[PDB]
């Protein structure tokens, strides 16, 4: 029985997890809830055996999990990708948080009716955040070295998003522009992005002022 | 040389980490920035050797970290507390996220000038969130069983906070009311709470509409 990954039919908080699964060439099925299926989900919420019911969820022969970060880390952990010692594991967790500051930075304002005003102060702070990654990649191929790790897919997802907000936010960051291409040059990812499973939009929930709607 | 833990002189995102250090009886020094030291911190931000400068930070003979979650997990990891296998480690990470939904739920609205209106919709959703923990503790002493883990201190910190917002939010949750007492009955914690190091207020940054100010 193939693992089930439930979530809205958007990119949201699970996009990075989808990408890690594709990368590892893991098999899995998806329980996607359409914009109007809110009710279809509420009637199942407390019937799946989840100790902490929420979206996304991940169910397979071994576990039943919720909290998108617990899920991506589990899939990575099952492939010995979380780090070989305390120090390395803390390096990888530091990369997770730094990426989330960016990604969550967008979500916290993408639902306000004053998006444009908020979008201005945000983009004034985004640069400092990007440059930390720009330097981290000065001599590395990927965030943790020569081998891909899950924070790589999270960062990719964050760049894909801040680029919709502002197509020029990476002009001063060549290594990040390259990092983004390099992730797409990975065989498994390129296949996925061109397959029928890829969900290109929306970025956030359909009702958001930014990254919302049924079409780009 | 004792590990240094830097942060504002508030509870904020580091309170749970302080508590884990006390519990493990680890020695450490703190670099606390007063309300008016914002400038004292900006002039040091890019001079500590941190790959991703931010508050809090943790510096000792082995690592230099940022991102509060990477730090608490490191201190726990160095004591073999993160879980003995993939499944257990995902259980503990699931507990982290579920706690943060509550804790971050407060911060996301504690800075708005319309706190009271927001505080109403929040408290209407808090119950469902608390009950997941209320059930998780139905037969367990602590969140992961008979032994304390870091999510325990995070949850404690979240209850201490939602209780200031509403002293009655735990009336229908006896196991949670007990969990909170039990954490305080732990020798090391009780000592800390009564020592000169404990910082009782503010909950958030001083400028917040809720949990702010120099006094309760
Ligand atoms: N921390 C949880 C948050 C889960 C969450 O916010 N779930 C939303 C969808 S993502 C909404 C979201 C939240 C924050 C940032 C971006 C986005 I998109 C939901 O509809 N849950 C189902 C329910 O509550 O019944 C996790 O990561 O799993
Ligand atoms: N994800 C980072 C966020 C760090 C952060 O927000 N730091 C704030 C203080 S906590 C503010 C905060 C943020 C979110 C929720 C609650 C709270 I209190 C800061 O002043 N950083 C120093 C700087 O930017 O130079 C982490 O957890 O370390």
From Swiss-Prot, chains A, B:
Its EC number is: 2.5.1.18
- Annotated keywords: Transferase
Q: Which reaction does it catalyse?
A: RX + glutathione = an S-substituted glutathione + a halide anion + H(+)
Q: What is this protein called?
A: Glutathione S-transferase class-mu 26 kDa isozyme
Gene3D superfamilies linked = 1.20.1050.130
InterPro entries on file? Glutathione-S-Trfase_C-like, Glutathione-S-Trfase_C_sf, Glutathione_S-Trfase, Glutathione_S-Trfase_N, GST_C, GST_superfamily, Thioredoxin-like_sf
| Domain GST N-terminal per the UniProt entry, residue ranges | 2-83
Family to which the UniProt record says this protein belongs: Belongs to the GST superfamily. Mu family.
**Superkingdom, natural source:** Eukaryota
Residues binding glutathione, per UniProt:
7-8, 41-45, 54-55, 67-68
Instruction: Pinpoint the GST C-terminal domain residues.
Output: 85-203
Q: What else is known?
A: There are at least two isoenzymes of GST in S.japonicum.
UniProt cross-references to SUPFAM superfamilies, sorted A to Z: GST C-terminal domain-like, Thioredoxin-like
Q: Kindly give the Pfam families that the UniProt entry links to this protein.
A: GST_C_3 (PF14497), GST_N (PF02798)
**Protein's GO biological process:** glutathione metabolic process
